[PDB]
Design a protein around this ligand. Sequence first.
Ligand SMILES: Cc1cc2nc3c(=O)[nH]c(=O)nc-3n(C[C@H](O)[C@H](O)[C@H](O)COP(=O)(O)OP(=O)(O)OC[C@H]3O[C@@H](n4cnc5c(N)ncnc54)[C@H](O)[C@@H]3O)c2cc1C
Ligand SMILES: Cc1cc2nc3c(=O)[nH]c(=O)nc-3n(C[C@H](O)[C@H](O)[C@H](O)COP(=O)(O)OP(=O)(O)OC[C@H]3O[C@@H](n4cnc5c(N)ncnc54)[C@H](O)[C@@H]3O)c2cc1C
Ligand SMILES: N[C@@H](Cc1ccccc1)C(=O)O
Ligand SMILES: N[C@@H](Cc1ccccc1)C(=O)O
Lengths: 614, 614
Amino acid sequence: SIPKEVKVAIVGAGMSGLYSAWRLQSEANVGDLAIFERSDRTGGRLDSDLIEFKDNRAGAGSTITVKEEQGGMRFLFEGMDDLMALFLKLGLEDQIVPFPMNSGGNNRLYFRGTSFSVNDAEQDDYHIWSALYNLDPSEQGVNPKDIINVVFNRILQVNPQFDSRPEVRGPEFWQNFRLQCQWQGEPLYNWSLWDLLTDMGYSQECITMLYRVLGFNGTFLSKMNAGVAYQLLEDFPADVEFRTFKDGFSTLPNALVDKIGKDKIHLQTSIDSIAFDKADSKYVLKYTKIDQSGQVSEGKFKAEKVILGLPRLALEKLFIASDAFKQLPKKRRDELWDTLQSTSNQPLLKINLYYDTAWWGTGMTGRPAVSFGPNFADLPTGSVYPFYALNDELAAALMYDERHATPNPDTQHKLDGIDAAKYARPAALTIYCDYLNINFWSALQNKGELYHHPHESELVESIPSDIFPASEAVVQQATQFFKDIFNTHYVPQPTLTSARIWEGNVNFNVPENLQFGFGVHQWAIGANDKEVIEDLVEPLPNLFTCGEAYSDYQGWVEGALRSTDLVLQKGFGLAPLSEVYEQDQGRSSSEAIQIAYRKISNKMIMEYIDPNFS
Amino acid sequence: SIPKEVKVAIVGAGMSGLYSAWRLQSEANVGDLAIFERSDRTGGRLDSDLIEFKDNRAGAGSTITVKEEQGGMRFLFEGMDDLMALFLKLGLEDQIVPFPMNSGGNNRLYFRGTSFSVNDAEQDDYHIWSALYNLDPSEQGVNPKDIINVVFNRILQVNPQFDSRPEVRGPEFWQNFRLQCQWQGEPLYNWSLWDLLTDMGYSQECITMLYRVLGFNGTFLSKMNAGVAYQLLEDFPADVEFRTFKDGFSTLPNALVDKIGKDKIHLQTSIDSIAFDKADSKYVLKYTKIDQSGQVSEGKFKAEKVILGLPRLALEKLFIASDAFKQLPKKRRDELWDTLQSTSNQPLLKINLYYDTAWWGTGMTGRPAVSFGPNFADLPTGSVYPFYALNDELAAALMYDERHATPNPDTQHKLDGIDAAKYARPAALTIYCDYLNINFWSALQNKGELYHHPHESELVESIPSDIFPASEAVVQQATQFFKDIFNTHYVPQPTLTSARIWEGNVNFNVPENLQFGFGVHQWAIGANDKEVIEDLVEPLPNLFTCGEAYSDYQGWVEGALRSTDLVLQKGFGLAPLSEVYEQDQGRSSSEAIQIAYRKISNKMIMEYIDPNFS
Ligand SMILES: Cc1cc2nc3c(=O)[nH]c(=O)nc-3n(C[C@H](O)[C@H](O)[C@H](O)COP(=O)(O)OP(=O)(O)OC[C@H]3O[C@@H](n4cnc5c(N)ncnc54)[C@H](O)[C@@H]3O)c2cc1C
Ligand SMILES: Cc1cc2nc3c(=O)[nH]c(=O)nc-3n(C[C@H](O)[C@H](O)[C@H](O)COP(=O)(O)OP(=O)(O)OC[C@H]3O[C@@H](n4cnc5c(N)ncnc54)[C@H](O)[C@@H]3O)c2cc1C
Ligand SMILES: N[C@@H](Cc1ccccc1)C(=O)O
Ligand SMILES: N[C@@H](Cc1ccccc1)C(=O)O
């Protein structure tokens, strides 16, 4: 049942769409709104899976749950003030757990046919990098990641006009960085990182090493500009403490759906075109809907205000098909189109292989155990992340680990036991790659038959609907790269697989359950994003645009929230959520979340790890 | 003056457009046609430059001409039967000269920070490749290019149903190859070459070596399918004898313009949209024109039949904007759009740096002289090709070289002198790269000020209009890669530069003199090009499509000619030019051209090289 008219029509049930609705209902007393989502699910590029494995351990119809992510997976307590405020208002802080990023040096590295560990790579003044890559002398004997850091320090040094003092470097800092810092008299948003490092004197061997060692080679090889590249590369410092949700990032959009009401959310309802009815000064939205039978249906409805919570490709499709846009004067039509081109499309993919037990621990490899964080490679895998069965005791040990406490031998012995026990429960690996590596897997995923473990139904009760199996060809090639990376003959067949290629589609032959947008976006060369962003808040009277793609904090939920807040301010009078939170609470979202989590983790530790913890 | 109506409207003055017009006038008695070209020039992706350098040698207002190419540059006597027939009918055979592809082993190779020669790489059972790349044992001790050849032989071996016997392997053979040969039960057009070699057991190190050593990394890293990849990779065998035109490939389209008449050719006239007038059963073409003042102008005219001699991107623009296409039923509209997606867009670029003298000969390097053919590198240059001042004596020596004659010491001594003399005349290097390397140069080309040698006007009289200078940043980075590749401290500043990035544009901010299509196209994964090709001949009644992009012989003029011939057959009754040539002449275009060139080169040799030659 699609209403004949609403006061606010929201297009897209991703974070931007759900967040708009929630804030409008809760703070602007707007009850007459509706959300229209082309897919059969909410959340967009947040997409968690909770798999209930048959527990077939010896002493066990009992079930073990493995959380995995097909989209976003992690966040930070600082520099994400809207997100934190959002978590606190929805009361989700008690589900926050660690997202560790290292195994104390045991994580794998695979480069130029050679498998080794992070610890190994440090040995002998980082000698291994100078053996694998033909580096200039000034490039030898230093940790590759530290080259990125040093170059960052150099950019700041030669831009003394640019105030580099704030301790928390959020979207503002990063915008001024790319728009006002220069190199050789050209501001960074006119640079590519590839050109920049080359101009600075780096060898192409060194540059290849960097874009392979860092995982996201798009920062170097795509059309994104060097300033925004650096915002992403300086997001994963050595000392990072990322967190996530026990049940996955989808906890967040599922919570918003609850507050919104499923009755206002129209799934399998794609907005095809938008026109303006000059008589009653209202927009007219043409849609297509698929009921639960397959019964297709076309229709139309009106809205006083329209909120397009949509990325670049989706906006371009609407723009091309929409009289509201076509009726515009030539000059402004073309200017608006050119503005949509100012953010690069960044493909990403995640392929998840689940296993009845984990095989990368010392028991199965005979080598130092791999636990958490990226296993990087110049293979097409890009980055490989382990996930483990949900386990409260394990999460507590990880919480203890987030402190830089010195356990006594009793506590170290218990932590040892907990670290080893996770290998005996179901687990998963995520292959997580970008740009240059996409095409290897997409051709593999669409060829031949799909993978299913025999007796799959005996292994997992219900397989979530958003799971499309990896192709048999994907599993076989992934299995061989895993043997390379983890330096082991032993990599068994997965119990369950999923493949998700976040690469926008323009082909009408693709089912709706397989149409996905680009993974993230990043400002292109020459893009003055300060102008672009304000231009896209409300490009036509009462029609708004918002989301990650043209945001301040690309690649992250926080960017979607901040871009949406701009729409909520200009079109509805609402101040930014983080400022509203601080007005209502007397303190920042950031301080609040840290105090609340500290308390939760304090008691988690005392209860599971060390009864006498500080 | 744009006619109110024509019987045939031809859109695009590239090879397909000019060739359509010429054959229609000459063979179908169609005089009432006109060509409409959006740019200020004919020829499209064929674009030669003839630069007249001030001759500032000691004993010399005399001029020296350097031919260069910004687009296509070479052809073959076999497997290009339409092109050869076309050359013969236009009487252009006497301007055909060699296009040599090697320097007897002295061409440069630069990989993983190491500069060496083709001869060097052969040494010690191809040891250098096993030192630079961490190869499997089965991958060691073999010439990299021979891995591609061997794998080709393996594909044929396991497809005995596929008749692999014809000596001249033209478009038909290559189509059946990619559509009917399989690997592991999947036909090649469902494969990517990257996936294919990986599945066959090759190391990623070996695969990286191959796509770097072979120049065109798009065959591996793009979305083109493995079958068409192989058509391109098996086009440059060791023993190739390419030819070209003394004054450049544009000799061909300039000759067609002459036969057509400039009066039927409408430059700076872009067709924006197409509609069908059901009353008088005629198409209505909306255009925009820019006179010689900058005076813009919009208008409309009708045509009985429309020939779109246009590549993928240009066709998609028209399709989106055209009522003739929009009025189509949903199902067929989407099917036609999806069909346009079946050929991948392959960016290419050429950056030409001209020098008053050549600096890569032994006199200037102290190393074995570099003469002709690609200098490959894993640097962003991709491939570097030398060009020399036009010189009849040099062309004769090259003609002698095409024979595998054994000169006596008198003839060898003269050839030695001729080889060395070309270094003392103006010359040029072309940087010629694809896919992965494009983004490095485009960001560099659009940053900062453009390069001009001081006193440029004293060095070259008139600079052709199609020359856009390379950026200063492009020249500085090219200069350093040249020192790397040619292993020399000495690389002077160029007298003149051009940059051409064959990468399609969707941004209204780009001048028309800087809008260029994608370099070439190649069938995508899953594309049944036999179905696609016939579907695109005449997608609407009396509206036709033709050109390289959706052709049988992608990457080459011959593909444009063959795709156009299909339009000439279906819509106008003309048989293929090569069959028409053979009917009129009693022998094939291929035999004719070889005999005529043999005669021309025979007399060229006797006159310049060896008075007593066989
Ligand atoms: C692989 C990956 C990992 C990530 N990891 C993280 C992470 O760890 N941390 C983090 O903070 N961020 C992460 N992100 C980013 C984060 O997921 C996104 O920034 C955010 O979820 C996107 O929200 P959005 O509302 O802007 O767009 P989307 O999530 O893309 O929502 C747009 C919605 O609109 C719908 N739609 C499109 N067109 C139409 C139409 N015509 N009619 C109706 N509906 C339509 C789409 O189906 C979709 O649901 C990740 C992203 C990717 C790709
Ligand atoms: C770098 C490079 C090197 C190459 N080297 C070789 C080689 O050595 N040998 C070889 O055989 N082939 C070579 N090729 C391929 C060869 O140049 C092409 O296959 C052929 O010239 C293309 O002809 P076409 O008519 O299909 O298209 P195009 O040459 O692209 O012609 C299309 C024309 O239509 C015009 N146009 C577009 N849209 C409109 C519109 N709306 N209204 C009006 N006009 C419009 C364009 O300006 C253009 O002039 C090379 C190609 C590239 C990119
Ligand atoms: N939040 C993203 C960050 C990202 C942005 C852009 C590209 C890739 C990654 C992540 O965790 O992976
Ligand atoms: N004729 C092209 C062949 C080619 C096709 C496709 C891509 C690249 C090159 C050339 O000489 O370069």
